[PDB]
Amino acid sequence: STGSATTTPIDSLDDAYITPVQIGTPAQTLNLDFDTGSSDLWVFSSETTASEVXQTIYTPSKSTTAKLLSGATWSISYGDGSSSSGDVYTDTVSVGGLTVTGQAVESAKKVSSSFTEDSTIDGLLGLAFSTLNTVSPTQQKTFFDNAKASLDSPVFTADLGYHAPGTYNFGFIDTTAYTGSITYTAVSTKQGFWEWTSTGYAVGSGTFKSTSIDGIADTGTTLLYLPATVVSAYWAQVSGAKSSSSVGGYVFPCSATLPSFTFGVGSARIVIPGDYIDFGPISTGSSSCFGGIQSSAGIGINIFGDVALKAAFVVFNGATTPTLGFASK
Numbered sequence: 001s002t003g004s005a006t007t008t009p010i011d012s013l014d015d016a017y018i019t020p021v022q023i024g025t026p027a028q029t030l031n032l033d034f035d036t037g038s039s040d041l042w043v044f045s046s047e048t049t050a051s052e053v054x055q056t057i058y059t060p061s062k063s064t065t066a067k068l069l070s071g072a073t074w075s076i077s078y079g080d081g082s083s084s085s086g087d088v089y090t091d092t093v094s095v096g097g098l099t100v101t102g103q104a105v106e107s108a109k110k111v112s113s114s115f116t117e118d119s120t121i122d123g124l125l126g127l128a129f130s131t132l133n134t135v136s137p138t139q140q141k142t143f144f145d146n147a148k149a150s151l152d153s154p155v156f157t158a159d160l161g162y163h164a165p166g167t168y169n170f171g172f173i174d175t176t177a178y179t180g181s182i183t184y185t186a187v188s189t190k191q192g193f194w195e196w197t198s199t200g201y202a203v204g205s206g207t208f209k210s211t212s213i214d215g216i217a218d219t220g221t222t223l224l225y226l227p228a229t230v231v232s233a234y235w236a237q238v239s240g241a242k243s244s245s246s247v248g249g250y251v252f253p254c255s256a257t258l259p260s261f262t263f264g265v266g267s268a269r270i271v272i273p274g275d276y277i278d279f280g281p282i283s284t285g286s287s288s289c290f291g292g293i294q295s296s297a298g299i300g301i302n303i304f305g306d307v308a309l310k311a312a313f314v315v316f317n318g319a320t321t322p323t324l325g326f327a328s329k
């Protein structure tokens, strides 16, 4: 089997992407944030504290296929400090025509304020390794892990758009969706992430510096977070750019034409266009724009988030020894 689903930016800035997910019988369609940096499928629900719901909800009591996972609970927090918790059902879940039975659907009893405030995201669908799942006492498998037995190939691909719709595919590689060839690179699962080591970087039309950048491929992170020295080298080539303590990162004049940023994948190179690094105005009508490349020092891990991933066709190879593939597009 295969699946193919359209993923859409939630807003004009590409802050995140949503993908429709069908849960239960009859199907209840929710728009979920597909997150290769976490491993829980959790949803706003009929169980969620009413004052914390503003979203489409899952109602397990309206699904003939929902089963309570007795004694199971979950609780998650993300890098931005957001959180949610609740109880667990198994139910039928379909993405892009690919159906999994018995998927753990984590029903929120409570959600944090950032989730309430974002009307566009009805929950998360985690695609990191199942060792990061937060269900207790027994962790639950991701949608991808549950799908592998039936898939034509144990792979999924992310093709995120720059201010445009894109695609998540499960079970096949669309050879028309990328240019050149895919280069694969080793993954470490020791921390539960799609963690890999980039071979280095270049700024604009300058030299490629060979330097091991260990980081994660994270569709649930908006920006590209890289080592302080690398980020400084980038913004050194932008004459109006400065680090802003109050705004929380590098800012620059919106009128600037930014250099590209290239990262290494083995011998191959992925070029992020300069326009992708212009995240957006700090407020509507500002002359100042926020940078899409920021230091990872405060996070403690380098993150190839949407700014980077949307410049590539990315293959998440979930064979027993996983690998990550990148192609230009």
Ligand SMILES: C[C@@H](O)[C@H](N)C(=O)O
Pocket: 037, 038, 039, 076, 077, 078, 079, 132
């Ligand atoms: C893995 C998930 O729990 C989250 N991204 C974290 O690392 O806190």
